[PDB]
Amino acid sequence: MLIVPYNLPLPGGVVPRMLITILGTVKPNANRIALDFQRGNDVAFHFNPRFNENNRRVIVCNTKLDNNWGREERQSVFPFESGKPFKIQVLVEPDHFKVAVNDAHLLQYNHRVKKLNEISKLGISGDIDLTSASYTMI
Numbered sequence: 001m002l003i004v005p006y007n008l009p010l011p012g013g014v015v016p017r018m019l020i021t022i023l024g025t026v027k028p029n030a031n032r033i034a035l036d037f038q039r040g041n042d043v044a045f046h047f048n049p050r051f052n053e054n055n056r057r058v059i060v061c062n063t064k065l066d067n068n069w070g071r072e073e074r075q076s077v078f079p080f081e082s083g084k085p086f087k088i089q090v091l092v093e094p095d096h097f098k099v100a101v102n103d104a105h106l107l108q109y110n111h112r113v114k115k116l117n118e119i120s121k122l123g124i125s126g127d128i129d130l131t132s133a134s135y136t137m138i
């Protein structure tokens, strides 16, 4: 049990083989979830499940540079459900973030921010009860 929004420091940034695990439960009638891997004010990787975007469920991924959002990468597959416990795993690979939800591969997101060792915070926010947030090296 953690306060949301939650800031998880990533000491010395991220690196290939680093696995980030987020456990929580989606609130009833959730509207959004967000993971924000930050390089200072920039958002290297924004992972944003939207539960009701024009009555559709979509996950939006993007990068924010100098306060400007870039080109979104949208995904049809939506493994989250209001009310239900989830696990998000984000594995840093040399050329993308690889995301699995509930042990099923979901998406990958190519590195736009290439100073991986400066991506030194993860913000976790949105309509969840957050159980734990941690990392390990595989």
Ligand SMILES: COc1cccc(C(=O)N[C@H]2[C@@H](O)[C@@H](CO)O[C@@H](S[C@@H]3O[C@H](CO)[C@H](O)[C@H](NC(=O)c4cccc(OC)c4)[C@H]3OS(=O)(=O)O)[C@@H]2O)c1
Residues within 6 Å of the ligand: 032, 046, 048, 060, 061, 062, 069, 070, 072, 074
């Ligand atoms: C609907 O179908 C498609 C298909 C392909 C592309 C888009 C498009 O780029 N959509 C964009 C575009 O309309 C853009 C124009 O300003 O706005 C975004 S919304 C924006 O998308 C960002 C990612 O690209 C990011 O998710 C923004 N959210 C925030 O920055 C943010 C931060 C903290 C709290 C928070 O609460 C909602 C929001 C979020 O801003 S918010 O006002 O709705 O909260 C939208 O997805 C749409």
